[PDB]
């Protein structure tokens, strides 16, 4: 995360770090949406234009972290991917439409002080919350500056949902309905954004309905990190729930 802070312990029981076997490195963030299913961005697993094509085999899931670096000896928990499901219309070629992927863990994650799943958006909550100027919370072990350098800790940033249109005159990229942008405006005199490392990251909300937290976005792309005039593109988790709920409810946990 760019221009943000340390996560306080247990600030995101959901936040999961998915990271490579060999070489033993980090590739992305995930959110644990239940004891067995994990929500990530697909481009973490597949971007044919850079050779990203990881496999249940080559990837590792580790739930309950805090420090980037150290293996959190008795909080942190490491899991075995049973399968990954990229979304049929994933569009890696053009602009990342429904740049999502579930992956079902080998065996169920025990919950804890530290491990807890996030709420998945209901049609309702989606209606009321996803609104411009409204803040949302993004998190992770990503570059601290677009270029250099990395946190030893989970960074958290509070960014405002941006107007549907504004997003658009920001990037020549062809923006869609399975995309929501988020940021502080040039002048809004406040900063932060996700970054190269972040992706699959949950972008959460707290319904002041029940005080539950909700995944709304997912980290997706945008140009650079914290470019004046640029805004991070997340994934309309909602917008894509049905496919989301089709599978869990098909071969899910």
């Amino acid at each position: 995360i760019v221009e943000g802070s340390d996560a306080e312990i247990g600030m995101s029981p959901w936040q999961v770090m998915l990271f490579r076997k060999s070489p033993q490195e980090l590739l992305c963030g995930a959110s644990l949406i239940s004891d067995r299913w994990v929500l990530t961005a697909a481009h973490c697993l597949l971007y044919p234009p850079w050779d990203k094509n990881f496999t249940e085999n080559d990837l590792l899931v580790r739930i309950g972290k805090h420090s980037r670096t150290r293996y959190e000896r008795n909080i942190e928990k490491i899991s075995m991917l049973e399968k990954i499901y990229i979304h049929p219309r994933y569009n890696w070629r053009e602009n990342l439409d429904r740049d999502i992927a579930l992956m079902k863990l080998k065996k169920p994650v025990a919950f804890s002080d530290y491990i807890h799943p996030v709420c998945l958006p209901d049609r309702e909550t989606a209606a009321s919350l996803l609104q411009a100027g409204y803040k949302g919370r993004v998190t992770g072990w990503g570059n601290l500056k677009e270029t250099w350098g990395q946190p030893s800790v989970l960074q958290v940033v509070n960014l405002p949902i941006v107007e549907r249109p504004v997003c658009k005159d920001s990037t020549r990229i062809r923006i869609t309905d399975n995309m929501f942008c988020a940021g502080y405006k040039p002048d809004e005199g406040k900063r932060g954004d996700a970054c190269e490392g972040d992706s699959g990251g949950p972008f959460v909300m707290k319904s002041p309905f029940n005080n539950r937290w909700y995944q709304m976005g997912i980290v997706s792309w945008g140009e650079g990190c914290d470019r004046d005039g640029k805004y991070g593109f997340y994934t309309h988790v909602f917008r894509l729930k049905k496919w989301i709920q089709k599978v869990i409810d098909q071969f899910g946990e």
């Binding site: 247990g10 807890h116 799943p117 709420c119 803040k135 005080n211 937290w213 909700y214």
Partner: peptide
């Protein structure tokens, strides 16, 4: 079931140093 309710935050009726930013958004 008991999604997005933290065992050390919501769950012990405490809130984070930034949560508040978030419900002040919704105005």
């Amino acid at each position: 079931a008991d999604c997005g309710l933290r065992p050390l935050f919501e769950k012990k009726s405490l809130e984070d140093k930034t949560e508040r930013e978030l419900l002040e958004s919704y105005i």
